[PDB]
Design a protein around this ligand. Structure first.
Ligand SMILES: Nc1ncnc2c1ncn2[C@H]1C[C@H](O)[C@@H](COP(=O)(O)OP(=O)(O)OP(=O)(O)O)O1
Ligand SMILES: Nc1ncnc2c1ncn2[C@H]1C[C@H](O)[C@@H](COP(=O)(O)OP(=O)(O)OP(=O)(O)O)O1
Ligand SMILES: [Mg+2]
Ligand SMILES: [Mg+2]
Lengths: 545, 544
């Protein structure tokens, strides 16, 4: 109970009551206290703050940032480039109410391994006068480390120059892990890597994979940052691929430290038509994600990219409450036919909730978000510091959620989708109907809408605690607490690894906002999980304990 | 208009009235709503947070800190030491409502220059097989940079190994200055000047040369606030060891208006256990922050400033009483009414400080991570829930005033820059407060002091309400922006010597804080410091 916690707690409790009675609609706020819709991050509504963003780190490292009275200059070393990444992540956090992500962590910091190598290559000609003017552009397969025991030539001062760069990058990544793990006040951070096939890129991947195995402190396991591995055929999946070595190392780390996660880049819906293996800027047309299971890929009025975009707001739905309210009728054809009428009126209600906040997030000032509306958003750099930022906000995304499929799969047929085949077919109808209605609203409201599988990181037992107080204790529904996740097989049901994958697989295509796959337990038991993610279309996956 | 600027505004607006109506006493609330006492940091009352502290960095840097789920290990390089210092100064800011100060900056960071130099030596023996096992304990006069154009043997490796340490320390100090200046969405101070070893001088020079280049495209920085410590026998006279750094500091202040100056002789900053050969002599030396705060003596402990600090302080309005005392014709009666109107308010302020002290106790050692574990004098002897009560008694409490010149014109008609009768009456209103502070310290069993408030959040609060109540009075309520504690008015044409002579005597009486302010080559700065030494000053600042 620090003073910082007691200050934000007061702020949170004095802002939500004002939001409900002065900033919402009588039609929408009616369902926000009736166990139908949960408006995420309601305490930050009066501040016109967006949720999360993928940082375009190339615009800050090349030309410095000038926020407030603090002015910086272009970086020239690995040490100063890694720190500026933390500064950007810790500064934009005070302007947005969600998480911060770095897409293409390998791509972004790759050039500054080269610059730090040229600095050493001219601090060794000072002691030893030599015209070493060719190591600037010398191709290097990778930067490796080995004993300097036996060498009597230029290589002994060449391999040593590589030898001291890895440690100067080794400490730079160890400081990155500790610095993002020391939350003093009261910071959610995520990094994705794996798709860069160069010497500079591969140096970053190994040196942060070996610092998440030793741990923080006296051997403790770190919690932040959240690390994600990007898997693509032809690069790092098959044994013949270039980065197969670094794929078989991340599975060893996950067997003792439970990181990183795995992102399936084939996925039949993560593909793009302007991705080439020879493009220096090919990282634009690749999917990146955060630890909150958020996807921002497509665009109805722009190019298909994820950099410099993000989420604006999202809300969660209670599909269990509708199903429980539909009991009593005997015939099964009418209970199911009444469920979809109770879902149409809440999807339309949710859609107006997002639009009413889109207008409020408009008419803002670019100076309310320093370092965001000047360097981080797509349409910035074309606005005076006060000119009503409106022509850059249309590229964001809006989300609609749901929770508790298994419980609503036992309120109409009696058995959930882990012990019945009739229960699995009805599960794809209660989801594919929601996906279709998002396209109608996006054309109607002139925006981007999507369907989300909510992480339930702040909604663990809010719905079931109040559902018990209304209807009672119903066997199999309100008798366990802790509603199951989006569509997962219940944790109290004995199921094998394979049978769990065949059931949760089809739903990932329908939900374009986010999804995950969880397995609870040698690295062989970890690679077999990733194999299940290729035999079917998965997208995201995680193994923990 | 940032969201973090609206959330904090909401928190303050919803927290202050609750403090007013459900946490104070009636006798103190009545005065706090009646332009007599202003309570500093009123919005942070319900959180049992203290104000400021001087960080003992040695315990953190020797054995690492474990706050929350983050665990750190002992440092081994200059970069890690500086980053750990920044982390400590940024973490404790979330547990206290005031500023953070680092005393003995050079003393604290000296050994890690040696550690980095040893690392460089052992890295340079790697390339060329040579037994350089004696440079670990080789005395060095100082670490200086020079060209390497022309030399050979076992000296261009052991002078260039020292020529790369200076760059590493230089970049470390530049990163420190820039990181303490970035506004994410923090008030910090560092004190240095008294260490005479090679490493301390290296650190002092490498930060003084960077507070001149500026931040960004050669722009003047604002943070951290830097303070220079001046002592006879070390860095004042031309014969002294650190005279060159003193002249360099004057040159930097001549164009960037930093650092300030702290007079260590002062007749009241002296200590009886300070020796020139003590490795721990920095304990018995005065340190200050940018908010004019002094924590030196102790009625129930040793005389030091490390690991101590302030708990709360409040400001008084002596102008209101003097304005209220007008109308009577004779001067003796008007003067005698003033001290009567002052005594009761002094007692009220003492009671308020004591009651807030009583509330601040009964806290938990787990409400201030790393503070009640590594940063206080009596910590490291408490279980994480043992209700700290035996470590809080070493803090301090503060009573302040504002507007001496205006109260000097409500009784006699002239302020203490145009009369000698008005200068004698200004040395009574402060000595009475000092005597009453000693009496209350004897009574309430605490430590109390008198302060000259910085007026960083009280600039025009009092004058508007006084104008609304009494009217417009020529010379009193006609100028806006009440003068500072005891300074000569800015609208009076005065030289520097006369201002120094007028303002000098008050610094001994005010043991909480004070400053001497001058508005414009290092010749002028040297003259200001000479004026400070000629009388007893303690603290001074020159800036345009
Ligand atoms: N920015 C940071 N914030 C918090 N802790 C940090 C930061 N940077 C480094 N640390 C931690 C990592 C270590 O536990 C500790 C000391 O770092 P360091 O000097 O590298 O020592 P070490 O013993 O880990 O190094 P070596 O690898 O040479 O043995 O400080
Ligand atoms: N910790 C930090 N926090 C914020 N800004 C920082 C930090 N460290 C460095 N900076 C800023 C200030 C510098 O002007 C800028 C560039 O750093 P740096 O790599 O030292 O470039 P430079 O051009 O000053 O170096 P050089 O001394 O080689 O000329 O980064
Ligand atoms: Mg280390
Ligand atoms: Mg630099």
């Amino acid at each position: 109970d620090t003073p910082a916690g007691m200050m934000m707690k007061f702020a949170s409790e004095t802002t939500k009551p004002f939001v409900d009675d002065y900033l919402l609609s009588e039609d929408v706020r009616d369902a926000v206290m009736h166990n139908y819709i949960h408006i995420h991050d309601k305490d930050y509504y009066p501040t016109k703050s967006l949720t999360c963003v993928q940082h375009p780190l190339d615009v800050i490292l090349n030309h410095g940032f000038t926020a407030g009275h603090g002015s910086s200059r272009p970086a020239k070393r690995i040490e100063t480039a890694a720190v500026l990444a933390c500064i950007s992540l810790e500064t934009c956090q005070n302007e947005m109410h969600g998480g911060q992500a770095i897409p293409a962590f390998d791509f972004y910091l790759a050039p500054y391994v080269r610059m730090s190598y040229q600095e050493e290559v001219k601090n060794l000609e000072k002691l030893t006068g030599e015209d070493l003017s060719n190591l600037y552009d010398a191709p290097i397969d990778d930067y490796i480390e080995k004993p300097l025991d036996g060498l009597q030539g230029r290589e002994r001062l060449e391999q040593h120059a590589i030898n001291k760069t890895v440690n100067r990058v080794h400490q730079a990544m160890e400081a990155f892990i500790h610095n993002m793990n020391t939350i003093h006040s009261r910071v959610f951070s995520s990094i994705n890597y794996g798709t860069d096939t160069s010497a500079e890129g591969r140096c970053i991947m190994r040196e942060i994979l070996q610092s998440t195995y030793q741990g923080v402190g006296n051997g403790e396991t770190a919690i932040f940052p959240i690390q994600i591995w990007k898997k693509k055929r032809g690069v790092n999946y098959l044994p013949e691929d270039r980065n197969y070595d670094l794929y078989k190392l991340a599975c060893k780390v996950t067997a003792r430290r439970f990181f990183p996660n795995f992102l399936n880049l084939d996925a039949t819906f993560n593909q793009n038509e302007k991705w080439r293996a020879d493009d220096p800027e090919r990282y634009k047309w690749e999917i990146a994600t955060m630890g909150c299971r958020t996807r921002v890929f497509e665009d109805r009025w722009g190019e298909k990219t994820s950099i410099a975009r993000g989420n604006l707001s999202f809300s969660t739905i209670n599909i269990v409450k509708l199903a429980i309210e539909c009991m009593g009728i005997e015939n099964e054809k009418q209970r199911i036919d009444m469920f979809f009428a109770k879902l149409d009126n809440i999807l339309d209600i949710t859609a107006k909730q997002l639009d009413e906040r889109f207008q409020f997030q408009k008419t803002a000032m670019a100076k309310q978000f320093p370092l965001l509306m000047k360097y981080l958003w797509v349409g910035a750099e074309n606005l005076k510091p006060e000119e009503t930022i409106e022509s850059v906000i249309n590229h964001g995304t809006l989300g609609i959620g749901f929770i508790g499929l298994a419980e609503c799969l036992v309120a109409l047929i009696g058995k959930h989708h882990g012990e019945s085949e009739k229960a699995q077919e009805l599960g794809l109808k209660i989801i594919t109907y929601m996906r279709d209605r998002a396209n109608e609203f996006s054309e109607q409201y002139h925006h981007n809408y999507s369907i989300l599988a909510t992480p339930a990181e702040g909604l663990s037992g809010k719905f079931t605690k109040k559902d018990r107080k209304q209807f009672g204790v119903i066997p199999g529904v309100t008798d366990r607490d802790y509603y199951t996740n989006s569509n997962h097989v219940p944790v109290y049901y004995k199921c094998t690894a394979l049978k769990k994958a065949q059931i949760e697989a089809p739903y990932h295509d329908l939900t374009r906002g986010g999804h995950i796959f969880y397995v609870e337990i040698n690295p062989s038991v970890i690679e077999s999980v990733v194999d299940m993610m290729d035999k079917y279309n998965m997208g995201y996956g995680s193994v923990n304990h």
